[PDB]
Design a binder for this molecule. Structure first.
Ligand SMILES: [Cl-]
Ligand SMILES: [Cl-]
Ligand SMILES: [Cl-]
Ligand SMILES: [Cl-]
Ligand SMILES: [Cl-]
Ligand SMILES: [Cl-]
Ligand SMILES: [Cl-]
Ligand SMILES: [Cl-]
Ligand SMILES: [Cl-]
Lengths: 116, 112, 124, 119, 109, 113, 121, 123
């Protein structure tokens, strides 16, 4: 149903893109393999490491979760910045569930290391 | 018999599953915009960029323009490259018409 | 100005449509040629890699021609792209009126399926 | 451009697809790598081996060309089967100069190009 | 803006069509003119006559404003009926309007 | 710059959507509320300008509730727009398992088990 | 087949590279208006010969405009957009007599057609 | 129950059946472009414009710009105005040409024929 999300915004100028669209599409991730390690680097500016969680379902995909809430002040024009985030990522080389996963969140950037 | 129009649609659904780098370059950043005390605040979620590289300008035609430049080394075999190398964001201003960069979040204060 | 999302969407789909899904082909394949000659409607289809037994030809109750074929493909090694169709269903609505049952026959050579069906009003 | 070949056929039903489109879209390829060889498999019915030409570009892409002539008889309604095939394929695995092997059977074209390393 | 409203509901089935949708859509109007008088015909429902407001805020514009409050008892499964209506028809100086049995009618020179 | 056809299509549909099709409205009507109170399901719907005799409410063999109504209108003088719907046929899918209505002031209220 | 389909095919195109097929279906833009007990249709149809254009009044109450021409392409061609065969079918706003004195004059690429309204002297 | 998509298309199709005058101002004119004799020619169907009112200019970005303005006086009740009043077609040129290059354009029977010297041409 990802396509359905994009469609709702076809009328909109790039200034006006919805928050709901952003929740779906965020985050952008680059992911690569090096030395028996599968690394994912995602982009989540303005979030707290307590609110970020990562997991792998039995099906071979990697999952990312993040919550935040934002206080609304004054005359409001934009609600774009996403509160909730849920991202499922298909995995090309299935890492063992047992293998440890380490995530480091720095400078609005999330990095995840996964052993092969 | 079926129709071509349906088949195209089924295809686009497949296509839009995993978005390009270029896509995200065009959409980023999501912004919050409010008016408090005769000041306009634009709040942008940016994957970390060096502060000096990030630039903000007010356009002549009542627009706000947000650019930024990044360089990334694609070490090893790359499965995906979603992240945006470059950014151009044009933002219309609601009302008639000083930047701080913290935790990858850009907060722009505009006098009014 | 600000930019159009629709533009972005369009720009996105293009580069992606360079590589087409296996499903897409399953619907689109085969190409055929259809002509009337000697009171007979001949149709020729490109179906590479399906065995003769697996391919089926049926005359529909509606005035249409249906080609059905299925296959199983071994998938060794690291698969990067798998565009070619495993199972085919194709429906063609005939341009002229044809005899209802059983006269059409099929020939399959060089991966090419040839059907010859007798037109209506033909003379034996 | 490929999308423009697709968009020109939107209205039509599946029985009515243009030959130009099929020329643009044929063949469907199966690509995988094994035994230090990258194998391409394409569906290409109604062609002669002498007419089928395979070249490898300077850029990463691999190109398949095929041509044939057609002999229409009588009143024709459908003419969809493609006369000239030209398919440029970007290959993921690394391959400037290489030794390519191609065998055509039963409309099926099998091309084997050796990737760096292995065997 | 108006096309953006339509596109929001594209995923949804005809029953699931949102409230915000309906607020923008309502009312469907029929416009005609008799004897050099202009007449407007609009389908508004479940609105109190006092709450409804009509004026022309531009030289050539028609604005209809309408508001209501709805309190929902029990578990509510859907809420499609609109709270506030701000349709802005455009006129192709005194307007007389009586709203009865849903139908709201406006009379212009 | 040459411009884009798509940009031209979007602009074209947009100018036209301000005034919408009466046939579009017919699909859309009515906006309904569905709540459950007193072990009963209630529907409130907005169908202004339609006669009580014209209105029909039926229940499906399927789970769905179905509202049917109809009306007739004659337009006097030149008509600039005729957005009003004439042939409504709403259908609603039901959340709670379900085998009776009152209409006033262009509003329909329906009660079900 | 439909008008919508004709537009859709060109969505992935810039304005300066629009298909000829598209132009054949879309040409000509017309002005249509009733005045003086007559219904006037003004069409923009350049590069044609009057001998090639024909006007039909249909079984249904619609006006059909047909035109056709040949253009031999000289040299190395980069763009062939201009229409070869026009077949514009226009639905009339008002009922008109079919047994009617209709006047279609071509001048400077502009086709002006006049049609008597039913019920006018 | 029906879907919004099916509903939307039905609406979309309706809005396209009859086309705006603005629409045509975008799409007009159709052009034929060929190169021969080391010069580039653009021939365009531009029916019903005064020759004086048409302007042709070579852009800084190797593209061709056709500008046409005309005034139409409407009479009686009007049921359609598809005819474009203002035209600004911008055409990307497939071969480098001189910005400085002298240009000739001819207007006859509502067809605009424009010839433009290609880069590397000899006068
Ligand atoms: Cl979860
Ligand atoms: Cl700039
Ligand atoms: Cl079957
Ligand atoms: Cl070549
Ligand atoms: Cl007829
Ligand atoms: Cl005809
Ligand atoms: Cl030459
Ligand atoms: Cl310029
Ligand atoms: Cl200019």
């Amino acid at each position: 149903t990802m396509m359905n999300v994009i469609m709702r915004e076809i009328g909109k100028k790039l200034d006006e893109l919805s928050r709901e669209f952003y929740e779906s599409v965020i985050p952008p991730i680059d992911m690569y393999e090096e030395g028996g390690e599968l690394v994912v680097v995602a982009d989540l500016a303005g979030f707290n490491k307590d609110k970020i969680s990562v997991r792998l379902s039995a099906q071979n995909e990697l999952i990312i979760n993040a919550e935040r809430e934002i206080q609304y002040i004054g005359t409001k024009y934009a609600t774009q910045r996403p509160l909730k985030i849920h991202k499922v990522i298909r995995l090309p080389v299935k890492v063992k569930r047992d293998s440890q996963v380490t995530a480091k969140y720095e400078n609005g950037v999330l990095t995840i290391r996964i052993p092969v």
